[model samples]
Target: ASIPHLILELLKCEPDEPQVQAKIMAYLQQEQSNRNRQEKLSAFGLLCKMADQTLFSIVEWARSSIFFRELKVDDQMKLLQNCWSELLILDHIYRQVAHGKEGTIFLVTGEHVDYSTIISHTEVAFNNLLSLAQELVVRLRSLQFDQREFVCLKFLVLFSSDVKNLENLQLVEGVQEQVNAALLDYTVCNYPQQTEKFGQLLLRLPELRAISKQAEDYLYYKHVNGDVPYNNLLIEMLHAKR
Candidate 1:
């Protein structure tokens, strides 16, 4: 019953002023602008700090909700640890959905990375993930995806039924089912114009997991290699269930 209202709250909790990228990268009108690899790498690392703090806020937002708190403490941690990457991926793709070039990458930090930067500055392994992420963004953007679906999908991601060792199995599954049903209803009730929208949204959820694994591994290696920073919140998310 409170799901819609809960979404209203999460919408308010959304971050402000994510366009800092354009302000700072003023000279970046074209991909060929001569920023050295060192500068771009360090700039990229700084933005990852933004990504870290975002998960911090995402956790706080989850913890603020009574529905999320209904889970047993350990179950809450397990679900959160298992699914934060997917949450971030959803958040990132939703935010980045409308860019002109499907190749532009917008991160949790509001930083934009050109495809050229992805090719020139990232490891070969991480590069493929960016391409995949960009494609996902483009696909979703085509669907006219909006904040309502994005927030609803996040709750679905959080209440996922498959996390290992969930003590309140039925409760978690029931919650996931409820959210799923509500989301479909939300789509169907609001937009009869697109019969396939809800199913397509569900189909996209599994794809996020594949993209998220690469993100988790990429961030882990960066942290291990001393290329980026991770706070305790992100550290917990990254280390859990590994």
Candidate 2:
């Protein structure tokens, strides 16, 4: 919701650009209308924000658990896995399914990380997310209704450098094509398509957070004003983990 709202607001900037602005404004209006009539927008945002706030707390709480520190890494991993699964359930109901199509939930962060870092983070996040979901499914058997969205957010975040890294001219073209394909499936307008994969990637939440605009005040707030609260919220979350 936050990301989509931001995208809409950004589009609203070019109001004089009739073709783009009018279409965007109309879509934004329809989305708002739908949300108001059916979704109860403010409550929805607050609910997810609160749950996210709680999940932030729980991640910190886990750091204090015996399982987190004293236990073997394998055991410690399970707790994080459980936390992810629970968070997925909350995310799905509050954001994913509620948004209807999986494509509109784009998470736009104001970041300046290197391209390679983006690929690395995206790959790590995607793998971790899938691993968590697979672990949960194997152990828990069938997923809970709400739990079904675990993998929705697990897609890898690609970097422009990743496409550049192929080196070969044709290979570079191929790589770019692949990237285009990937994004064609998960573009900002159709974020729902990437939700399952994106959800999985979010299991690497800490790593992803490291590069997010929310991670650096100098960077994040320079671009987004209201995002400061979220940045503070995330920092408090990190401190809690410590």
Candidate 3:
């Protein structure tokens, strides 16, 4: 099978694509409209619920691709468990940039909770996480990042060869090779004049790697504190397994 066609296969499973994005993106969050210490706590909880839902979609989106499917089932979950946080952060940033909204976090359910509101309600540590998220959003938003770039970038993150203890190192790198090419094809084909655009997008990967750590730390802290609700996928991913 041609790699570009494989890239086509990868793109087809985007969480927000072809109205499959619907049932989740369109479902209005029927909870939380008040502001209090307790109500603010609810935001984190509601966000957890959204986070859990996104994890399921990420699994569905990733597992549907042949390249991802080529690995053993154990490796697939291992990759998702290792990188789901980064993938989730990417989805969140893409949505924020896509909606052309900033200075606040968006719930996947279409609600906008101001950063200040959330920061005020949460622990002191969250303030820093919010700042990192804002910085990430601003950096990506300044560029001409689009949905295709987003999906291609996602697979690049997904098919990482460095995720430690993988059952098929060569297989992982093969997928990464194709994902890298897809991003190039996408950038040049769409933005011929912006030669540096490819470099810019690739550079953001490290920035994401750095930011995902901070994001996970904050969630893990909250998880230890019992602020985050117990969804098996959320906790399992937030914690660790070899």
Candidate 4:
């Protein structure tokens, strides 16, 4: 059987059951430790390459998706502005140790920047935001989400109609409904024992937006200080016009 089917077979207990929760926690902690060890052993520049590829993939995926053409130009920009940071941060945390596991996160030009340096400098100005980002990272690692789930989560975030200042709300809602059903189907197929998993996953939406806002502030800090090379596309996606 495939991995999803195997997971379903192994999940024989109720999701809320104490034993099941304990098992899940133990499994995730072990997974996080294993990844941390591997991260330490791997070369520094590997994550840098992965981050660049991830950025291009995200940009290309958005460019090619039908939703890009289905909405008005302004709405398309709005959608990208709202969703890009969330997706980018998701990819970053999944690929490297944003917290707990100490390693560097990749930059656009395959640069290996220390994660602590990025945050410690802004620790006072953006302390709460950094805390939330780290918390989200821990939660995501605990879930040990696979690539399929990550892609689905990205789609869910992109199609969100709840983003403030969104024009053409009807079209966005329509797309989100379809994505929601698709995500539900996948969760049910892969996590049959945890009927509530879909709802739990959906709850991450607001948390993601909160973290994205923090990212926006952090980027602004870097920009004003002229700390790094500016990428036009990155700026365009994050700095949506009002």
Top lDDT prediction, candidate number: 3
Off by over 4 Å in 4: 1-56, 96-131, 163-169
RMSD (Cα, Å) for all candidates, in order, is 5.7, 20.5, 4.0, 12.0
* Residues 92-195 of candidate 1: C-alpha lDDT, one tens digit per residue: 67778754355566654445667686678766776787678777787787777777788778888988887889898888888677767777777776767988
Candidate 3 lDDT, tens digit per residue, 19-127?
A: 5445555432333323334534465677677778777777888888767878899899888887888898888888778773555777666667777788888767767
Clashes per prediction?
0, 26, 0, 0
Q: lDDT value for candidate 1?
A: 0.71
Q: Estimate each model's TM-score.
A: 0.77, 0.23, 0.83, 0.61
State the TM-score for model 3: 0.83
Off by over 4 Å in 3: 1-6, 16-41, 102-104
- lDDT string for model 2 (1-242, tens) is 32233223223322122343244345445555766665344422332343344444445444453213443444433334423434433332233222223223211111122424333544354334433433433322222212212222221121122322232334324433443444334333344444344334334444433323222333233225442224344444334343
Can you give the lDDT of residue 104 in candidate 2? Answer: 31
- Name the runs in model 1 displaced over 4 angstroms: 1-41, 98-103, 107-119
Model 4 Cα shift for residue 194 (angstroms): 2.4
Ranking the candidates on TM-score from highest down gives: 3, 1, 4, 2
Better of 2 and 3 by TM-score: 3
Worst 10 residues of 4 by lDDT: 6-15
lDDT of model 1 at residue 235?
66
Query: Residue 181 deviation, candidate 3, in Å?
Result: 1.5
Question: Best candidate per TM-score, number?
Answer: 3
How many clashes does the backbone of model 4 have? 0
